[PDB]
């Protein structure tokens, strides 16, 4: 029996016996993702080049912002594109807070590298008028999170209490088809992923861990390396094939490089619901209590056995 994102979300929402807001929020997000996908694949670019005689990152942010506002299900929206949190006007306010990266990896979009949209949804905790503070909740409080990967094909990965589910976008009918149910990551993988160009500035624990991947002390087979440079692409591969992904702090970026609210937490949430792990090295990414919407956070995630191994090394140097 075929299942669609719309059908799947509607059913889960029905079981929750709530107001239906999260359902509308996700439906709206889904529509925005399809619009972003269409623009990313360059539909209509011919008109830009004069067949008849805005930047993608900006368009993507506009699509998400507008669809979420018009869903009547949100009150505070934090985007990687905007310096300040966006406060939804009173007549369209809902009880949810959304932190998102409209188009992850767009910086190197020129090379047609895979790009994506990352999102994390929280239920407003405070009763105060909506403000940026409502987005400062630990990832542990997420009600839903995931991402859309615009790679060889477009896929939406949605994680919630019921687990992780993957939907493939069928461009013929503009429908997200459920192709992988209640996904779980491999206990242990054979791929490590990180920008080794930072080698010179790596912390000792990262240096040793990577060394163990290339020169297994037990003389087992060395791990293969992959690093697309786009978090959504690297994380998704990690989910599908297992292994480990790292974007640790650098000497130059003492608090890591990736952002906690819309890059780390969402992926950490997907990973844990898939039976995986995500740590800053000191604690679970999901337990970090944010003080700034754009603060950075180090992150090491993936197969449990792989992350545990890294933590062992980390502890040795602590």
């Amino acid at each position: 029996d075929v299942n669609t994102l719309t059908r799947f979300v509607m059913e889960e929402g029905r079981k929750a016996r709530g107001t239906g807001e999260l359902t509308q929020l996700l439906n709206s997000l889904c529509t925005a993702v399809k619009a972003i996908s269409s623009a990313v694949r360059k539909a209509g670019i011919a008109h830009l080049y004069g067949i008849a005689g805005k930047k993608l990152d900006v368009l993507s942010n506009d699509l998400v912002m507008n669809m979420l506002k018009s869903s009547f299900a949100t009150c505070v929206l934090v985007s990687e594109e905007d310096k300040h949190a966006i406060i939804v006007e009173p007549e369209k306010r809902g009880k949810y807070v959304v932190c998102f990266d409209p188009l992850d990896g767009s910086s190197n979009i020129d090379c047609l590298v895979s790009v994506g949209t990352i999102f994390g949804i929280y239920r407003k905790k405070s009763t105060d008028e909506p403000s940026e503070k409502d987005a400062l909740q630990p990832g542990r409080n997420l009600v839903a999170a995931g991402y859309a990967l615009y790679g060889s094909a477009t896929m939406l990965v949605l994680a919630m209490d019921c687990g992780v589910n993957c939907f493939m976008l069928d461009p013929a009918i503009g429908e997200f088809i459920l192709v992988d149910k209640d996904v779980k990551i491999k206990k242990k993988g054979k791929i490590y992923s990180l920008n080794e160009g930072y080698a010179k500035d790596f912390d000792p624990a990262v240096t040793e861990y990577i060394q163990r991947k290339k020169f297994p002390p037990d003389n087992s087979a060395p791990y293969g390396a992959r690093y697309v440079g786009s978090m959504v692409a690297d994380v998704h591969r990690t989910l599908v094939y297992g292994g480990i992904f790292l974007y640790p702090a650098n000497k130059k970026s003492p608090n890591g490089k990736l952002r906690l609210l819309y890059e780390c937490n969402p992926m950490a949430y997907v990973m844990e619901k898939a039976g995986g792990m995500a740590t800053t090295g000191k604690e679970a990414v999901l337990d970090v209590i944010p003080t700034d919407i754009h603060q950075r956070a180090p992150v090491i995630l993936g197969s449990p056995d792989d992350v545990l191994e890294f933590l062992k090394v980390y502890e040795k140097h602590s």
Copy 2:
């Protein structure tokens, strides 16, 4: 003035004052690429999952059938077939095509970028068409390039007139020229290779990479990128500059990538863009093949970067 792949190819073909075969060959290849793109993006997958109650193989079938039906080819070598395919007499043309229908499909499960690579040669002898016709050095290529099915689909075509990039507009199924006579940066800031092979690296590769991470002159270290799909990594190299490596080692003296449909085409694109592509010992394009599926080591990209690698290579030779 907008330009399309069809219009561009037709015009160049007209200037050559030939039979029009290469034009038809490229038109057919273009159509196949759009079909592969459509399937790669998973159009119609809903029917596979029961809404009404392999990609590598499909891609090879699309290229094979379109090329044969173009009446412009006589010998077809594919990464998917053990032996060279000989076009039936009634559909034979003067060209030989070596191609990889869907490069990087091995990891297609993670939705990693994939692509199609191709190299076109003019048959050199009047001998009945055979596998030998595809054993020409890349230096003899008349046209070569690839289609990248990434965030968007792009077709990169290299010929004597240079390198031109066309973006596929899915709304009208038309390849739009967006970058003309492309040239790669003299020097980049990104190195690309599977460092998981570190333990088995050749001494020259180990030192070169060490210089990218720990520049002896204390300059900024290079960033690392390795998609795992040749078309994706090579295209990034072309767009941003830098270097790409899939070298040889004691255990793989000739490398892992294939000369005919992976190395030669990319080497050709690189040189036409003012870049370089070496096996370490000689230019990839000068290697004279003896086997259609033979492997070849390859280091390509910005000239200053490749030259630097060669300096290190020489140091260990």
Copy 3:
């Protein structure tokens, strides 16, 4: 503020405070319509012609609607022209709704690329017994929702319910039905008449006179223009958009008409009335006919109120 079919239906369903079944039913129908549209526009036809080295569209369309409706868990009885008998949903997937539909209206002459469409009518099961064909034998007056999808120059879904008639345009770039016309109302009177005049010889006297009045106005006013696509969804939609009248009447040859009551007449009659229009068999409102056979035919004259009323005047003159 943009609105989509999914958002619109979800909201209306929420206001009804029910089980959410009709919402799932409509979502599923929507998905099927997009799939039908894709196939109708011939996506992938290249594969059929050997680009890489097959079932009829009416059959595929029926399969799409049937499968999506069954999988919605919101239906129990499905009537289509395809199957002679009503389809009874298996117990484990039964919902409280009954759906009567025409998977691909006008497919008979589809080779000419004439506009085609999907027509549907949704009823709430009334009986307490086991689902059967009988549950589809309700007068159109009992419809909870009805409409059609027109696969013409563009694809549009017209949905009629108590709240009125709303038109959604399918944006192929994102596979989303965009609301472009809200609470639509048909013009009080139009200037176009639509029917197959090839049946002239067998026309009922009332139809003959009425048409005569459209071509040769009694008060020498401007004669009406004629349009007849041959596809009910196309002709009816034009009638809704431009106003006027559509006829597929009965006669000596066809005493009960040619179009089907359950999945052709009732749905269009429902859309017409919700839009402030009319739909009569000549004797009574189409919506009031109590069916005794799921495939029974019914004569139908619908469109602008003033035009239908005028027809009825002529009809009465011959009665």
Copy 4:
């Protein structure tokens, strides 16, 4: 062996051993048709209705005009949209003259009625400077003509000396696939098509002919009636199923309503190449010598036996 419009045209052009201009002209027209089709099917309409926060007839004209000019194959362009003939600038001039209707039937497009693009291509016959006069050639001089129908699906019908060929647009790959080769219309059909709302003003010959279709003299079954209201739709159905199409002259319109250069001649050309007929009642549409680029012309076309029958009636009243 699959064939595409691009492949088909390139091959025919090669056999002509010319400059390649008509090939480029057709390729360019093909691209324009795909762009028009995309817009007609309303791709991107979501952006018009605010998903992120120019009329079709005008856009269509712009697409055809721009693509034809940029083909470097034309010198004079006549469109139903522009009062005066468009003269291609010197640096982009080619030897062909094109008369076209960018979007036929767009007047009633609000009802989603089928619409289409009609075109007729002539070779400039003069040696002087390009002018409106170069478009005043009888249809008999056409080198190529046809139309694109944007109906349930999009199809391009191309007629040339080699015959009539039909190509279906596959939206998945934006390719026109040849599905019907060297098409021939039925000797006799069973459908008549005309706006009977003009009955009161019908010419006596038209009145009698239609009367014969409804009340047959040989007691054969009456013809069925069909009238979409869009010439491309009605003419295509006539081609596919056979029969007859009429848009005759009456009391008020002695010269008919449809335009000779970009509506009548192209369809007349398609019909004759398909073994059909097209008459004004007095002579073959293709033999009319135009004196005004926008002049009207009566037209009766379709299956030969049907047109011949009409002509018999016409002669009876002459």
